[PDB]
Paper text:
There is a family of proteins that have been shown to enable growth of differentially culturable mycobacteria. These proteins, known as resuscitation-promoting factors (Rpfs), are a class of cell wall remodelling enzymes called lytic transglycosylases (Ltgs) which are ubiquitous to bacteria and some bacteriophages. We focused our studies on one of these proteins, LtgG (BPSL3046). The presence of multiple Ltgs may suggest functional redundancy, however the results of this study demonstrate that LtgG has specific roles in cell division, motility and virulence of B. pseudomallei.
Crystals of LtgG were grown at pH 7.5 and diffracted to 1.73 Å resolution. LtgG is comprised of two domains, a large β-barrel domain and a smaller α-/β-domain that is an insert of the larger domain. Residues proposed to form part of the catalytic site in the E. coli protein, including the catalytic aspartate (Asp343 in LtgG), together with threonine (Thr128) and tyrosine (Tyr130) residues are conserved in LtgG, suggesting a common catalytic mechanism. Most notably, the binding groove is narrower in the substrate bound structure, allowing interactions with both domains. To confirm that the aspartate at position 343 was catalytically important, we generated a Asp343Ala (D343A) mutant protein. The mutant eluted from the gel-filtration column at the same position as the wild-type enzyme indicating that it was folded correctly. Zymograms performed using equivalent concentrations of the wildtype and mutant proteins reveal a complete loss of muralytic activity as a result of the mutation, indicated by an absence of clearance under established conditions appropriate for wildtype LtgG. The D343A mutation completely abolished the complementation of cellular morphology in ∆ltgGCFD. Thus, our results proved that muralytic activity of LtgG was required for its function in B. pseudomallei.
Residue numbers in the entry: 34 to 271, 280 to 372
Write the structure that this text describes.
Amino acid sequence: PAGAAIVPGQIAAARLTPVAWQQVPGWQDDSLIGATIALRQNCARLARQANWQRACAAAMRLDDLDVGSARTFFETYFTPFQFANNDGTLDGLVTGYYEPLLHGSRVRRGPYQYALYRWPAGYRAGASMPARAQLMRSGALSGNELVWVDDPIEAFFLQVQGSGRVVLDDGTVMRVGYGGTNNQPYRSIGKWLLDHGELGAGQATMQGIKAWARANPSRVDALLDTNPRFVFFREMPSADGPVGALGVPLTPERSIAVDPSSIPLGTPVFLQTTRPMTNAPLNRLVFAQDVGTAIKGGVRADYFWGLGDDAGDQAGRMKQNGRMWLLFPNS
């Protein structure tokens, strides 16, 4: 029932080594559910390249339910190449990312009681502000509200990420991105709850912190004030996941960010790794559709877990050994 496991520390004599599909350990462990969705987004940018025209034409005939036919397609139109680091090692690091998804309103009302703030107009770009607790008390933020959300813990973790999306009670969606900082030190509230015994070793996830906050509503404001850092936001230019560097919406658990000088955008990658909390095998066909400032090296990926806080808790814990095969179209 559980998938193929990595034998660590193996090495290879070439950067790319063609292998048979029968030599990809883990290929049969992937259901392939969702892979055709990310494949069609890939083809939106690749279909007219000479090497991709035939594969993309065939790909448009596949539905997303018949994973038997999708498996036959990948085995027929692509060859897998075992991918090594330039030092010959096959092991590399898989981390994770997500897109925060909050629920808010453009006006303060009902459950929407916690503001996200733009950079305060009464202030000069890049001048140091006080800690969060005094910034919130000075009055300097009043009238600089960008939108009002559902939950102060979600707002806090949106600040940690710097960017995300707010589903508004409109029926519209607002994308927010990085709008500046008070340049004061970050201090994790999860570590605070652990260091002071309020949360057990297991449990300082975003969900465990939300639960503790639910239990201790009159302590929440003081907990958040233990982090002096404060992040501001800007509204981004106006259905599916975020758009990545390839220019297409990312697909949860089927898109990775890569170092594009090692793995060009558009490359499908068979990823063998493990799940962050249970450590079970995770064997997944993904597509290189994004990049990131921390994602540098050869066998290196950021796995896109999807939208919302369960995806973020998986992303937060992901720091797993991994193996890669790059697919190239037979063409």
